[PDB]
């Protein structure tokens, strides 16, 4: 008689930045997934391996709830087979992703006059991200060939740069809170089903 704590993920006080996206696994509970789609309050509700068609009637071993904050035109990159600064360097979904991508505009909380710069992202990286990999490194990105020695400079840039979230920003630049539900199946006890 334990419902899966989705309120701790969606209704959380503060959200993580996409470079340090926060994963919270959910197990041994009951999930009413149709509650999320029967809300009409989400900007993006796209499922890729599961169907939002009242298919809480199935079980999964473990489902993970990744959450972060990105721009409006950057939630397009939260999808299988996508590229870009978020998809390549911050958060990557597999080409055979099985789950749902949920997002909603949050300019009313994550934007303030004068600019909200608490959220940031990764702009440079020596290689792309494999699916569900996270990088929270702060090592200086060597663009040239001279050793940066841990210093910014010519062709040596700090990898993490800030988001500017103003209330007058366009919809494409406004902060959007994203939650990714990744359902996983193994030869395992199939913890979470949900009636």
């Amino acid at each position: 008689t334990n419902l899966c704590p989705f309120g701790e993920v969606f209704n959380a006080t503060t959200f993580a930045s996409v470079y340090a996206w926060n994963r919270k696994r959910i197990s041994n509970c009951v999930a009413d997934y149709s509650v999320l789609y029967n809300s009409t309050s989400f900007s993006t509700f796209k499922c890729y391996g599961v169907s939002p068609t009242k298919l809480n009637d199935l079980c999964f071993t473990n489902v993970y709830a990744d959450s972060f904050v990105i721009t409006g035109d950057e939630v397009r990159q939260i999808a299988p087979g996508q590229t870009g600064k978020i998809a390549d360097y911050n958060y990557k979904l597999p080409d055979d992703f099985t789950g749902c991508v949920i997002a909603w505009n949050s300019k009313h909380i994550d934007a303030k006059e004068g600019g909200n710069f608490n959220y940031l992202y990764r702009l440079f990286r020596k290689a792309n991200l494999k699916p569900f990999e996270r990088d929270i490194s702060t090592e200086i990105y060597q663009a040239g060939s001279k050793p940066c020695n841990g210093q910014t400079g010519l062709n040596c840039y700090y990898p993490l740069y800030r988001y500017g979230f103003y209330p007058t920003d366009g919809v494409g630049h406004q902060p959007y809170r994203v939650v990714v539900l990744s359902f996983e199946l193994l030869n395992a006890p199939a913890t979470v089903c949900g009636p």
Partner: protein, 596 residues
């Protein structure tokens, strides 16, 4: 590990750091131009100084990426606009005096006041004092006074400052590998590295003079037509073979002959359009003017204005809580922010400029996906050209009766069309000889073909010959008459208004060609034809990424500026002017003067 890939990463850091610094620049500049205060002035200056100091920071670092080893053209363009030294290759002391000249020359222009010797109690500035006299009065001496006293009391103050303005601007120009400051301005049209669409700086002057030679037949018959019409309003002053006196041209400089319509209307007993009053009876306001303009663009397949546009832009006068710069502007602040600052009233002139200003936003929103340094028109004349074509399609009765603003039973005949085209020629055709002659004077002054002790003699030598306009009072070298215009004393290129005129009729012809238009070109209205809006959008989304020679062909089908579409727009008037001048004298003699 190429210089090209190292520049792509350098441009990545630039495009992301400049977005917020440029946003803070204009977001603070917006709160001044709407809530004018010395507090908001310094907020506009502090935010604007840090942005310009950032542009200097990145430019010197961008200099360390030589374009000789780079081959990607879009990477070349962003670095070129960034590697631009500009006002910084000068010394650190004559850069301050150069700006001190620019700030003082602009101050004398905007604060200049003159008074009449018959009642010195009231004193008039240019706006709205002297401009109203030059645009409404039929008194020869009242126009002569306001004309002469402006250049004799503020223009003479600018002659020493302009003489020092020419040398400092030329020192900065040649220090940036240019021939002169005029050759620095012509660089906006230069294209290198694209074989088949290359266009150098010297090629502009040859093309400007070439297309201008094919306009003179139309301008001469327009010049001779109004000259006979002006002879009826000024009988003892005009001569049927001489040039037109400068103070009888509609405004202070004669840049536009628009206000001469009441004196030169062909069929003045035919009804004017002037939908202004019909807007007041229908309880129109500022929002409905722009809301109707939005529906014009969505009819040709263009997106609707952003939600922040209606939320943030100021569309009417503040209402006695603030004071603003009511000059119509279109704002591209970055971060997907677009605004329009214009204190609109219920007027047909404001209803058309609303379509003109919203046309800028549609251009601004189209190249938003482009990198920061490529978010601008193809050249200087592209942005203002796409704005005019929106008012052209909106001003025709084909569009006015469509939105229910003109009574459907309007006597639309061949006489009303001549009145409309004559009104159009006074504004459009009348400014071309004024624009070209003014810019070429500055072109030859910057190179040095006009000595300092003969500035005003050669200025009026080309006024009499090229423009067909003679001064009413002889001016020695103590005068500075070109600087009595805004664009000359405020450091602005002026040839942009010439190419803008020719671009807007190459655009309109090509759009109406794909908009299923039958009949004369001047009666076209591209709305409801999404095929025309798509052919226009294919060029707006490019921005500065591809050369203007290629971007022009994406719509018109020609790789260079063409004058034929302009002449065909006014040919129903051209042939009408030919017969109305059968017993008149077309042309002018340079030796005649109203002072003899």
């Amino acid at each position: 590990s190429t210089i090209e890939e190292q520049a792509k990463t350098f441009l990545d850091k630039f495009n992301h750091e400049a977005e917020d610094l440029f946003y803070q620049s204009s977001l603070a500049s917006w709160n001044y131009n709407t809530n004018i205060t010395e507090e908001n002035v310094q907020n506009m200056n502090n935010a604007g100084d840090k942005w310009s100091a950032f542009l200097k920071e990145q430019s010197t670092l961008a200099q360390m990426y030589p374009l000789q080893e780079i081959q990607n053209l879009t990477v070349k363009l962003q670095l070129q606009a960034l590697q631009q030294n500009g006002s910084s290759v000068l010394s650190e002391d004559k850069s301050k005096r150069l700006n001190t000249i620019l700030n003082t020359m602009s101050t004398i222009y905007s604060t200049g006041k003159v008074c009449n010797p018959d009642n010195p109690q009231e004193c008039l500035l240019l706006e709205p004092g002297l401009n109203e006299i030059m645009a409404n009065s039929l008194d020869y001496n009242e126009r002569l006074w306001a004309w002469e006293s402006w250049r004799s009391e503020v223009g003479k103050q600018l002659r020493p400052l302009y003489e020092e303005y020419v040398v400092l601007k030329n020192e900065m120009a040649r220090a940036n590998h240019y021939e002169d400051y005029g050759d620095y301005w012509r660089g906006d049209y230069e294209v290198n590295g694209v074989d088949g669409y290359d266009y150098s700086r010297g090629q502009l002057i040859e093309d400007v003079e070439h297309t201008f030679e094919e306009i003179k037949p139309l301008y001469e018959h327009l010049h001779a037509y109004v000259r006979a019409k002006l002879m009826n309003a000024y009988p003892s002053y005009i001569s049927p073979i001489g040039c037109l006196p400068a103070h009888l041209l509609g405004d202070m400089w004669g840049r536009f002959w628009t206000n001469l319509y009441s004196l030169t209307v062909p069929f003045g007993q035919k009804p004017n359009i002037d939908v202004t009053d019909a807007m007041v009876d229908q309880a129109w306001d500022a929002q409905r003017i722009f809301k109707e303009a939005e529906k014009f663009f969505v009819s040709v397949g263009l997106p609707n204005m952003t939600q922040g546009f209606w939320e943030n832009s100021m569309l009417t006068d503040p209402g006695n809580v603030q004071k603003a710069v009511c000059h119509p502007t279109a704002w591209d602040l970055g971060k997907g922010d677009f605004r329009i600052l214009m204190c609109t009233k219920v007027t047909m002139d404001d209803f058309l400029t609303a379509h003109h200003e919203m046309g800028h936003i549609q251009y601004d929103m189209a190249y938003a996906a482009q990198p920061f340094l490529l978010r601008n028109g193809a050249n200087e004349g592209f942005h203002e050209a796409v704005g005019e074509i929106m008012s052209l399609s909106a001003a025709t009765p084909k569009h006015l009766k469509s939105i229910g603003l003109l009574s459907p039973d309007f006597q639309e005949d061949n006489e009303t069309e001549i009145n409309f085209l004559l009104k159009q020629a006074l504004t459009i055709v009348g400014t071309l000889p004024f624009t070209y002659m003014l810019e070429k004077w500055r072109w030859m002054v910057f190179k040095g073909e006009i000595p300092k002790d003969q500035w005003m003699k050669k200025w009026w030598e080309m006024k009499r010959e090229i423009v067909g306009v003679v001064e009413p009072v002889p001016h020695d070298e103590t005068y500075c008459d070109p600087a009595s215009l805004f664009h000359v004393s405020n450091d602005y290129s002026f040839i942009r208004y010439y190419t803008r005129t020719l671009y807007q009729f190459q655009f309109q012809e090509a759009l109406c060609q794909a908009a299923k238009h039958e009949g004369p070109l001047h009666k076209c209205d591209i709305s409801n034809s999404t095929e025309a809006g798509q052919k226009l959008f294919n060029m707006l989304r490019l921005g500065k990424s591809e050369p203007w020679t290629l971007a022009l062909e994406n719509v018109v089908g020609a790789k260079n500026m063409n004058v034929r579409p302009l002449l065909n727009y006014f040919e129903p008037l051209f042939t009408w002017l030919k017969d109305q001048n059968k017993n008149s004298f077309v042309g002018w003699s340079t030796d005649w003067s109203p002072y003899a």
